[PDB]
Design brief:
This protein has about 90 residues and is an alpha+beta fold. It has one domain. Helix content is about 20%, strand content about 40%. It contains one helix and five strands. Strands 1, 2, 3, 4 and 5 form a five-stranded antiparallel sheet that branches. A hairpin with a 1-residue loop joins strand 1 and strand 2. Keywords: Signal. It comes from Fasciola hepatica (Liver fluke). This is Cystatin. The PDB classes it as hydrolase inhibitor.
């Protein structure tokens, strides 16, 4: 118990919030170029003291490849901030 849900489709509001956070992280880590079209393929969630969102993301023509990236969203009543994890390269299959 306490593991991830099965992957699911990403909501419009989730794309709006998390896609630029994940792009910014991949860009600052030197993993993608600034022109990268990044797609959130799916998300799996784990409820802790807050929520872990595990994304599988795909790059477009200038950033081909897939990464797994975990984002932590804490509870409002917490001293902790929203944190993007370290991206890991994964197979798109």
């Amino acid at each position: 118990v306490g593991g991830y849900t099965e992957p699911r489709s990403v909501t419009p509001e989730e794309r709006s919030v998390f896609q630029p956070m994940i792009l910014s992280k991949l860009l600052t880590a030197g993993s993608v170029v600034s022109s990268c079209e990044l797609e959130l393929l799916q998300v799996s969630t784990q409820v802790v003291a807050g929520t872990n969102y595990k994304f599988k993301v795909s790059g477009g023509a200038t950033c081909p490849g897939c990464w797994e990236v975990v984002v932590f969203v804490p509870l409002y009543s917490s001293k902790s901030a929203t944190s993007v994890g370290t991206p890991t390269r994964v197979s798109c299959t």
